Structure formats: structure tokens, C-alpha cells
């Protein structure tokens, strides 16, 4: 429609356009040059004299004589529909699977309105992830924000794919329940490479998990503003589904470190003085606006659950990114380099991990009544086992008592059978059975943290229940 | 298994995409058939009037030389100037007072900018 | 089995042809509606 | 333990001082840019 | 009202021209949607307004209007039983008229303008009124709300409305100057409300918990700090303080909590029962709620709004308990705001004026003589949650420099099922000596010496931990095993207090005095018997141990008989022993 | 432009035992090698140029010494192509922008090299691209930004440094050419952090996009232990995808031997924490055996001489044989110490020197040496009984 | 300064070993001083006069009381003269630059005056390029007989190897000789620490037909043995010396003897043969099976002779 041709300055990612006071702040524009190619851009500052536009991609062919700028949209919006399930997008809503575009039921602003605190309710139901070290000891509750802390060489992508493939609800354990409750997975990847992109595509298509999933994939060579936009679009779709069609959505964010770095670059490009250690001052508020979009709402049947994934920059928990993610999320799951190098997958370390909402999603009427005590006993026993393992290197095996030797054997069996489950999908009952089989190695009466009725009901099973087909 | 259902679903989606793109081609043919019919003066005059309303401080009116005689009535009414240009057909462009801003009211532009909303409605019309 | 996959493919082809004919049954009305809405 | 703790605190002080100096330099150069733009165009 | 237009937009910062006459830190409405913001800089004919919500979609040339007043709260009837955000916006009515989301530019009133109130005058025409006096009363649940003249209003009464039903808007009193006085008035949140005189810390703040009331007391009008380790039962202690303290009004402020934690606190309180009346506890509380994704300015102003409301209720003549949760989150918001203004940081990125702001917040507490001549007090208990439990954080360092007490809540004790899980080795209190005369005149003349003896026993028990660590406890001789056992008895029977029990949830000062007397007497008799040559295992199976242990669970009125019976049995059992 | 990207399933045989075994890199993958000055980046890159199995090698000397380019120019014509048999220089392209050359050409040299590599890939070859230092490119960008008077980020670098690095590194991969052929580009880039500080922005940006990471240690370089790779800090994401190729071309149990070696190294690293506290003599005999086996692995398998006439290159089968010998000796020693044979006597067994010196055996003499050494391993412990 | 003067006094090629044209051309010295004090300058002048080397020397003197900005020009003028002499009159030129630290200080002064973007600790961002324009002017050119050899001298500010000046210099140059304060405090001269030192062009000029066939392996064995000795020195500081094994005691004794006999020579001129003999005498302390880096032929040829046959 209406175009502006008064370009007066082009440098780096920015260009200035004169007599453009009709452009709203934050608007999305299209930039066309003499060759007819069109680029994207966002308005970052509007004045009476000129407007400043941050250009996506690159400014190679631009010139001050032939370039023109045209408006696209006042506010960034996304078109959503229930037909998005089974589709892949590039991070700004553009399809990349070769299928025709969807017809939106409505168009919603990607930035979200905060939930009213009086409209929320307490999370009270769990999600079966199929991984024993998460289901039993760090249970994920519907409406929680439980991030995963990983390192540079650890296999976080494999764990993300496995959880996305295996996650499900268990209505039968909640009294009678309803056998039909919709479940969906929203997957958002930021700054991934071609290899990771191919791996994710293959994993989602080879097992049928694509039919219930919406994928937003953003590559490492894509513009950084698209990386900024990707999680917000994913969460917009998730909120729409959950709170308009009563879906139980699970959102996975592949790497928030890439998001933080892109945010830092964007802030530096707009001439803003950085805060602590070079990161933007408003980093906490931005991460809060992302994370705090999950939960359960009173009077609604849907829910949103988030699992952020981030690589600790130098295996340091003091770094601003993990530290600020800790302030906003409820617990964390931390991977161990030692377990990974020992050949154990998934390399989840129970001792530094923690789930802060676990106590509300377990018990009677959900999972089983022995869940909490079994988890506590496993934690204490594993801690004792690792301590005795450290001591036996010096004082030798013969100098240990019988209980200490039993604890050491328990720790080895725990590492070999409970943590190292491979690609196997375990229901919660299977994990509880394996936990009781491991606890049976310890003598009865050493189990301080379990009540007598549970021991009488479950103690006494042999490890061959799982050792036969681990 | 569900793989055959996936084939059915993707075939349905591809058929719907073919349907919509063929509809788009027929619509574009019908729209480009307008300049050969006596109905084009009224629509181009209305589009030029809307474009001039879009720029309150518009200075000049610019179109292909075929339409300038029709636009002379608005040029004398609104007081703007007229100059020929081999620009896109089925639309009239205007130039602001400063010479920096510029509007365009091509019919293909309206089709491109309205098809996003029209696709959802015509999906119901087709089926 | 391959026979079931062939049956699914034939069913998809038949349904796609039927949907194509159904769309052809209303192409004129859709074109007229689009032309009416696009015009001022 | 106290010696390593003191060394850690010393290194933290040094890094924080360098960060503060960098922030000061950035503020000065941004002030120069803004002043030149707003005064000479 | 000064009215201008938008000139430049860049993020939340908007430069408006034609605003000559606008005043610094006034609240302005930006754009056609009327987004609120603050003027932070004036330059020539322009003004720099910074908006709270997002500014996407705004255009150059939209109107900007200045209200002419700084950030302020409305003080009057209708605040009790209410839930507010950081800038006093009623969340319930926003939910009613908007849905589950908080859309931008919503307009609601802090006090309902439609509810009727039972006015009851207390002045007559011709009377002279000074700021702080009582004009009339209105029943608000179990309270009698006193409509106070604003602190800066003086004149003579011209007309008074008769008793009846009115909203908070009808002018009930009009002065000879023509000034109209309504049931409410507004007050800036950053200016302390005036008083006549600040009294001394002479009376205690009874919390109902034996450890806090005895070992680490806090005076009425004092200040305290408490850490926030996970799993330590901080919320249980906070709601126990709300339920059982001698405060008349409770103001709870959550400035930057997580979403689910705010959900827990917003769901639990409407279920608690007020012990004094049996009705809901919510009828005497005000809740200020803020999650992490709410605007930064609200999170920064939440504590000031809370303390201003507390000061108002103090001026009415009550005693108010103010609980601020996670002041670390407030400090984080302050740091972000300072960063947006490009200020040179100090220490760990915080602004250099962090300590000044913390002192300004904490120093509004105290027992005062109100302008009406009555007595009122405000007590502040602020929670501090360091990044990793480190006490070297500038926030914690500046907080511990001004508070009068510090109750180091511990997670290790909670792991061992010791509740309340308060570590008595790291805690301290600076109010004991000042409160001593009150104890001597109100509970007993011997109480301070008994408390010092109990603390000495605890310290002596703590001193033996190295030997018990290195060598098994059973190897120790009698004179040390006795002190170990009496310390264990103290921990199990006096320090611990079950908050879910019907009668153990609340304990008076005299009950604590009796329990301490019994424990000290038993220890003295056991020491004498040990000096006489009896075996310790003989002492460990005396019938008096159960009598001491069950002293917690006896009723309050039934206590004195039980106390004297056990004191008699203290001598009865030991004289039978050789 | 290309037609389609492909998954990597074929190793890039660098010729160094540690890189080829512990931290493999696929044909179309990317790798990085950071370290302080003196660590051995340039020697490693020249060794990869000499001994790798790529069809064409493109060497980019971005902002480094001219004597290195002179050494390459003088030596390469006299060497032999490992596969073709012709002169080594006939398969090599050099782009040189030395330290004292104009600064603005440092940015251009990287693009020229990668474009030439992509062209040769489009012809249907497998190309290896060696970037001598990307830190010089970053410094040139910083200098130009300083001239522009821009707002810096982190240590004065321009904000778009990470975007530029990602755009450069994403040009690698195994593809289907527009002509229907198949080719690949492998990128190995060296990093020069200021002061060896791995927290520097360029190194952190490189961490997030490479598939393999080869960290160098100054402590190992000081004691003249080369290739001086920090095993605790290095990793490789291509290990799982290359397993079928190893099973088909090296040995059916090769991944198991590699896993055993990795487990032994990790156990040795764990025990060294106690060793640094109480000394080796405080440990039990099994722990001492683990420590000694770790030392043997460090000194006789990971160590490789770039200038020795035979140790310079190593095949996959030679490394497999050495690993098999080490594992067999470890099993025998563990069995012997389980029945009470003292460790302090085992360390003087004569076959230890044969295991240690098996590196220098010729590629064609090796199998007989391996058979004799395995039988001698069996005999040295069977004769004890 | 003493080490630089000694190197300039004793430097010589060995044509008889390499079989080249037996010639005795003396080095020409170009001496550039930047911010030098009077004490050091007088020492250098007296040393050159004593050796009689002033007639072959060109001196560019910028004392500490001279203007600071003049230091930008001195290295360039010195290197221009050196290049002219070497590549147009077939001289073998040795260049000594007294303190690049003062040069970097002047560079930082100018950069701060111009409002440049700093690198680390305020030094300008183009310092790497500026230093490379100076260091990279040495070398040899095909078809010509002359050569330029550079021996820059710089002071690490707090003995901190990670300071920007030593860091960039190490990234540009072709090795470094690092001095140790610990060795100096023990009275050892020259206090050259072998572990942090490096020579990148060492392999080009050593081996059979240049110095001797055992040179490289002897060097590697010495490096490994000294590193082991230093680690055992660290260990004995924790577990005490009486708790050592016999092998660790041997390595500790080797490290002590190395520091007291190989490094510490004083003001004496050792030929390469003497140095190799001393190195073999030191290596003979260790058991023959501990010399893994050396081939058995060389061990059979040279191992066994004791240190007392040299001194004592
Ligand atoms: N004073 C008390 N009396 C009785 N039980 C208590 C008391 N304090 C804590 N508990 C018990 O111990 C638990 C403390 O662990 P929990 O994590 O639930 O605490 P919380 O009150 O939610 O606080 P926090 O947020 O610090 O974890 C309480 O839930 C309750 O079961
Ligand atoms: N594999 C190796 N074998 C022998 N010597 C090596 C090896 N790797 C490095 N070196 C030595 O390390 C020195 C450092 O040189 P270089 O490899 O150029 O390091 P960088 O480029 O990391 O500074 C080289 O001169 C060489 O002497």
C-alpha cells in the first residue's frame, strides 16, 4: 500500500527512514530494494523526524536511492488453529514442511497478557515422563516450570526428544477420571544447528509423536530477532490450545542460553548499557515474562507445563542465566558429566536435583501412597552409598562393616539399574517396583523413612523382576 | 497402523491446497479481465479517491497514461496534479507533498493483503 | 501388510478425487465472493 | 580453606573492578555519541 | 491539567512535548489508551515519562495527560478482606470485568464507590478540627473504622451529615473554608505519615511461639528479619504469626514471588480461622500480591504501599503486623529500575542508594502517639532470601545493620522434624534488656535469670559437641551426660511447638515461665543426686520426665494446677531416690 | 546453493590416535581447537593437512606468522599424497594474510577460503578447511568497529560477532550437489583466547555451534607431552553416529574397547582427587593398578610424536591393537592382584616396555608385533599361575 | 640486561658441525632503547666498549627523561637500518630492543588521547597489529646471504604472563625465554626457567648433520624428568620427604642437581658439546629403563659416564 522512500542512513543492522511518523512502535515492516528482493524488519524507535528500523538478516544490497519501506502489521501477531498439530514452522510462523499454510481461527499478539494471580489454582496432578529418576524422585506436576541444567557435551537433546516422545497423563490413577483428556506437546528450538535439526525431525517423524506436536525450529544462522520471537510464539500457541480447547500442553524450550545470547546481542545493537557481566538489566523481567506463562487456571480444564533446557556456560551455577532461572522456576534437574562418561544414559544425578512441587502431585489418589517415603529412602541410601564408595578407596573393603558393604553394593546396583534405563519407557508402577527391588537389598529395619505397612506390603521382591528384562 | 491415516490426511491437505491455489488463479484471471471491460473507470476512480483520502497532504497523482483522462475529474476536484508512469495496472498511486512518502492502491496488492483473511472464509464456502 | 497400505492409498486417492469434484461444484461462487470482497 | 577463600574473594574484587571500569567507558562513549548527534547532526 | 502530545517513543520511555508546568514524579496517562507512567526528567518544554506496561502500538502525536499528583494510595473503608497488586488495584474486580488476563489500561478504584456504610457522626457544627482527629465511625466487619481528617487539614466544622447510609464519596463534613471531607483521602506512598512522638520499646510483641517470645523477643514496634530456606516451614511460621500474634491488623506483602507460591498464599488464607472470633482470618488482613511477570514499578512500590496502609491503620489506634516476603526480589526490581536509568552500580550491581531505601522502609516501624493522642504501633518482619543462602549479600548485609532481631530459620532442624526449625546459635535479639522491666512487672520478677540459665544450659550442651562427635556419647561420664540429657529435654519439651495442635499452637508467657521453672528444678535436683552418688540411668527413668514432657499439651487455664502438681512431684520423686 | 543436506555417517580420519578414537569428527562435521600460545594448534592443523583422507585441503592462514606459510610452501612439494601418490602440494590451496599484512583483509580471507572449499565440494569432492585463527578475524572486526565508533559488547567486540561466526560455521556439511553428486566440507578452526581464558566471548560462541571440541592444556605443553589434549575438557557429538562404520571397517568390538578406555580414564581422574590429598601410597592395590594403567594409557597411547618418522601417522587398526593390548594387560594384572600378587612386582614386568614402544612399529610390521605381544601378555601371567 | 649482553658477546655459528662454508663473519648489533635509565645504559655502553663491539654497532638511544611520544619511532628506525644492512650489504644483524613495555605505554597514551576502544586493561585494540608491524620484520630471504635476528626484552608487570603485553608478544613471536624469580632468589644465574620457555624453530636447526643426532631426544628426556621432579617437589611439601619411595627420591635429587649444575653456569661460555656432556651426566642418574624418550642406540652410545669427571 503506502511506502516510504526517504532513507537517510544505513549502518550495521539499522536504517533510518524520514517522514515515517505513521509507523507504530514495534511494528513489522518490509524492506525492498532495487533488485526486488524483500527483507523483514522491526521498528525500534519512532520520532517526529525519523524512525529507526532494525533489519533482519543482512543489508548487502541496500542503497539510499532505491530502497523502499512498507508496513506489514502494527503489532506482531500469529494465526492459530487446531490444525497446527502435526506441523513445523521456522520460528516466525512460516511453515517449513512444504504443506499449505493454515487458515487461522484468530490472530493473537505473540506477547502475552499476564495471568491474574486470583485466577490461578494449585497444581495437583503429575505427568508420567517415562524416566524413573524423574517420575519417582523429581516428579513433574501439571503446571510446573522444571528446567534441566546441562553442560557442553552432555546429551540434553536426546533427553528432550525422549520426554517429548514418552510423556503422557495417567487418568486411571486419579480415581476413575475421564479416559479422554487431550494431550499435546509444543517444541521450540532456538539457535540449533543443521545436525540437531535433522535429529529432531527424524525422532519426531519415526515414532508418530508428530501427530500430537507443534514444532517451532530456529536455526543458528537465522536472524536473532527470530530467536527472540520463537518462545513467545510457542507459548502463544500453547496458551491458546490449553485455555480454549482444554488441552494438556507440554512446552519444551531447547536452549535458553542461545536465547540469552541473542537477547544480549539485540540489546547491544540498540545502544543499551549492559548490566551484570554484560547481560541486559531487564534480563530477569524478560525471563519472567517467558517462564510465568504456565500454570493451571481455576474454572478451566486445560494446563500448561514448561521444561526449559539450558546449558550452563562453564558448568557454573553462579552464572547469571542459571541463577536467574533458579529464582523463577520450581526446582531443577541437573545432568552429571561423571555418569555420562561412565556410560550411563540418561545421566541424571539425583543428589543435586530437586522438584519443589513434588509433594502435591503424589500420594493417595495419584501414583501410590508409598511414593514419598520410597523416594526419601532412595535419596538417603544413595548418599550413604556414594560416601562409603569414597571411603573404601582408602580404607579398603575388609575394614568396612557389613552394612557399609551392603550400601556400596546398593549404590552400584542403583546406578546400573535405576538411572541407566537406556531408551526404555517405564510406567510409574515399573519404576516403583524397581525401586522396591533395589531397597530389598538393604536389610529390613535399616529403612528408617518408610512406614511398616508399606514394607510389609512391598518389601521382599528380588532384582530379577527387572534384571531378567532390563 | 496410523501411517495410512497420515497418508490420507496429507493427501487431503494437498488437495485442499490445490483447490485454494486454483481458486486464486481463477480470481486473478477475473481481476485482470477488468481492464478490458467498461467497468474499470469506476473502480479506478474509487481507488484513486481512497488513495488520496489516505494521504491528506498528497501533492501529485500518478498512474498509467490510459487512466489519466478519467482521473482528470478528481484532479480538478481535489486540486492535485497528474503525470503518467508505466506503473502497475488496476490501481493508482499518489505522491505526498514532501516527495518522500508514497501510496499505492493496486488491485493485486489488495488481493495479496486480503487473501490471508479471505482464505479462512472461503474454506467454509468450498466445503 | 502391503495390501492394507495399498487399500489406504486407493481410499486416499478416491477421497481426494471426491473432494476435488466437491470443490469444483463451488468454484464459481468462491471466485465471485473473492471478487466481491476485494473490490471497493 | 581460609587462604583459598581469601584468594577467591580477591579475584572476585578484581573482576568486579574491571567490570565497573568497562561500564564507565561505555557510558562515556555513549555520552559522546549522543552529544555529537544532538548538537551537530 | 497539563496536556501534551507524544514526540518520541523508544521502549517504555516516552518523550512528551508541550508539557510545560508538569511536576517531577507526577503520574501521567500516555496515549489514547491512558497507560500510566511517571515523569522522571523535565527539560525545557518537554517531559520524560516512563510507562509501566508495554508501549507497543503507540504512535507519535497521541495525547499525554498529567494528573498532577505523585503515586498515592486511597485510605478509607473497604480495604480489609481485600486483595491488591503492587499499586493498589483490586484484583477481584479486575477479574470480574476482564477475565483471567490483566489487559493493559484497565481502570478500577481501590475502594468500592457503590457499597453503603453506616455513618455515625462524632462532631457538631462550630467545632474546631485539626489533622488526625476523629470525625465519625463506620462498622467494618468486627472493627469500628474511624474516619480521620487528613493530616494537613485544619478549620472549623460548618455542617455534619446525620447518621445514615452513604458511599465513600458523600461529603460528610464541610468546613467553613468550603473544604469537603469524605470518608477517605489519598496519601503519597513515599512520604511517612506524621505522628506526635515515638515511644520506647517497653512492651513486647507476643507471637505465641515459645522460642521467639522467650529467647529472641521483638518489641512492639520493632523490626526482625528471617531467611527463606526451602523446606524450613517459613510459611507455617508466617501464618502462625498472623493467626496468634497480639496484632489487631495484619498486612501481608508479596513483592516478587513465584506464581505458584502466590497461588498457595492466596488460597490458604481464605481458609484460616481467626482464633479470637472464630470467623475468617481474612476479615482483618490486607493482601498485596505480585508475581514476577507483573510490571517492575508495581513490584518496586509494593512495600511502600503496604507500609503506608499499615501506617494508616496505626493512626487509627490499632497495632499492625506487617510481613514483607522476599525483600530480595524487591531489591532485584530496584536494581533493574536503576539499570534502566543508566546509573553507576555499587558492589554486586545494586544502586549505591540501596541501603538508604532499606532504611527508609524499615524505619517507619515503631510505637507512636498518633495525632489524635491515641497509641498505635507497627511491627515489620521482612524475609530475606539470598542467592544461595550466603549472608554476605549486600541486601542481607544492609538489612542486618538496622533490624533489631534476626531469627535464623534452619533447614537442618526441619530435616530432623524439629519445629519451629529455628537455629538458636545463629539468632540474636537486641530487645531483651529493654523489655526486662516489663517482664519483671508482668510475668515474674525472676524470669530474666531463669531465661539466662536456660540459655547457659543450651550453650553448655553446644560446647560438648566436639567430644560427642569424636567419641560415642555413652563413653561420657555422668556430669556431662546429665547436661546432654537436660539439653535434649529442653529441645524436646520447651523449644518445640506443634502449630497444628489444638492447644499447643499458642503458648502464653507464664506457661513458658512454668515450663522453664520445672526444667531448671529437675536439673538442679538431678545435679544434687549425682553429687550424692546415684547412677544416671536411675535418674533417666523417673516419673517426672513424662510430667515435664506433657506440659506442652495442657490447656491454658488448667496449667497452674498441673504446674504446681509437677513442682511438688519434683521434690517427691527425688527424695524417694537416694 | 545445494540440493539437500545429509546426515554424517563417515569419519574424518585425522591420523592422530586421540582425535580419531576418543573424540571423532565426521566427514561433514565441524571442530574447534582452542588453546594458549605454545599449546600446539598449528602443528595439529599441519598434521591434519598432511595425513588426513580428504580429497582437497584448503589452508587459511588468517593473521598468523609468515614463517609457517614458508614452512608449508617449502615442505609440502617434497611430501607424498597419502592416497593419490603424487606430490602433496598438488591437492592443497593456501590463502595467506599474515600478521603485518593489512587488517581489513583478515575478514576477506576466511570468506575466500570457505567459498573455494564450497566450490570444490560442488565438484563432488570431500574438502577439509583449516582456519588458522578466528580470533584474528574477531580482532579485525573489533578494530573496524572502533573506527566506526560503534557501541561494543563484552570485550569491545561488535554485537554481530556471534552471528558472523555461526554463518561461517554453518557452511560445512555433507550435501547432495545441484548436479546430483555428493560432496562434503569439514571445518576445523583454531581459537586463540587472550591469556588462555576460555570464558572469552569468541570461545563461548564457538562452543555453541561446533560438533567436536578439542581443548589444549598449557600444563601438558610445558612438560612436552603432545598432542597435549585436555581429556577432561574435550568432547565429541559424532561418536554415536559413526558406530556402524567402525563396526564394519575396524572391528565389531571397537566401540566396547573405546568405552572401556573411557571408563578407565574417568576412574583414574576420580582417584587422582584422593591421590592429591593423601598420596598414591595410601591407596589400595586395585586403586594403584588403576592409576598405573591410566599413566600407561597417557604415556603410550595418547602420546604421539608429530616429527617421528613412524609415530607421525597412525591407522585405525594400529590404535585398535594398542587398546586391545592395554585392556588385556589390565585384565591379567587385576586377576593377578586378586589372588595376592603384589603390584610393586608387576610394574617391573618386561612386557611393559614392549607395550610402551609398540607405537614406533611400522604400519606393515605391526600385526606380527601385535600377535607376539599378545602371546607374551598371556605368558607373563600364565607362567606365574 | 646481563643475559642480553652475554648472548651478544658469545653468539656464534658452528660451520664445522653443519659442514657449511667455514667462515667467521661477526654479528652486527643494532641496539634500540626505549625509556632506558642511566644505570642500564651505562652498563650496556661499558659492556660494548669492553668487548670492542661498538665499531660494529648502531645505537638508537631514547632515555627515560626523553619525550614519551618519540618511542613510537625508535623501533621502526632501528628495524629500517637493520633491514637495509642485512638485505643490501649481506650482514648478519642482531637486534636488541630494551623494553617493549615502555613502547606499549606510549601506545596506550596515544590511544587514550584519541578515544579508542580499549582491549584489556585499557590498551588500544590495534596493539596486536602495531606490535606485529615491528616483530615480523626479521627473518631470512631466499637468494640473499644476510639475516635479521631479534631479541626483544620486556618486563612482565607483576610477573603475570597473562598481562596483555606478554600475551600478545607470545602470540606474535616465535618462542620466549622466561626468567624465574625463584631461581634468581636462590643465586642461580642465568635464572632461565626451562618449562615456560619455548623455541618454535628448534627442530629446523638441530639433528644429524647440524649439531648432533641425540639433541632432540636428550632435550625431551630432560623436559620430562624435570617436570616429574617438580611434581615430586610439590608432593613432598604435603606428605613429607621421609614418606617418599626410592624412585621419587631419585627424581628429586635429579631436579636439584639439574638446577644447580645445568642452569647455573655463571659468566662462562659453554660449547654445545660441553652442554650435551653435562646433560648426559645428569641423565645418567636415572635408571636406564626410565629414559623412554631416547632410542636405545644413543643410550648405549652415551649413557653411563658420571658427573664427577667434569667437576670434582
Ligand atoms: N511449626 C510447625 N509445627 C508443625 N509442623 C510444622 C511446623 N513447621 C513446619 N512444619 C511441617 O514441616 C513442613 C515444612 O516443610 P515445607 O516445605 O512444607 O514448608 P513450607 O511451610 O511450605 O515452607 P518453605 O517455603 O520454606 O518450604 C510443613 O509443611 C509442616 O508439615
Ligand atoms: N604433536 C607434537 N609433536 C611434537 N611437537 C609438538 C607437537 N605439538 C606441538 N609441538 C610443539 O609445540 C610448539 C608450539 O607450536 P604450535 O603448534 O605452533 O603452537 P600454537 O600454534 O598452539 O602456538 C611447536 O613448536 C612444537 O615444538
Numbering used by the authors:
A (entry chain D): 5 to 474
B (entry chain J): 61 to 187
C (entry chain I): 81 to 120
D (entry chain G): 169 to 209
E (entry chain B): 1 to 578
F (entry chain A): 194 to 578
G (entry chain F): 161 to 472
Task: Please give sentences taken from the publication describing this entry.
V/A-ATPase is a motor protein that shares a common rotary catalytic mechanism with FoF1 ATP synthase. The V1 domain of Tth V/A-ATPase (A3B3D1F1) is an ATP-driven rotary motor where the central DF shaft rotates inside the hexameric A3B3 containing three catalytic sites, each composed of an AB dimer. When powered by ATP hydrolysis, the V1 domain rotates the central rotor against the A3B3 hexamer, composed of three catalytic AB dimers adopting different conformations (ABopen, ABsemi, and ABclosed). Here, we report the atomic models of 18 catalytic intermediates of the V1 domain of V/A-ATPase under different reaction conditions, determined by single particle cryo-EM.
Cryo-grids were prepared using a reaction mixture of nucleotide-free V/A-ATPase, containing the regenerating system and ATP at a saturating concentration of 6 mM. The reaction mixture was incubated for 120 s at 25 °C and then loaded onto a holey grid, followed by flash freezing. Hereafter, we refer to the structures obtained at ATP saturating conditions as V3nuc. The V3nuc structure, obtained under ATP saturation conditions shows all three catalytic sites occupied by ATP or the products of hydrolysis (ADP + Pi). In the V3nuc structure, where nucleotides are bound to all three AB dimers, three distinct but associated catalytic events occur at the three AB dimers simultaneously and these events are coupled to the first 120° rotation step of the DF shaft.
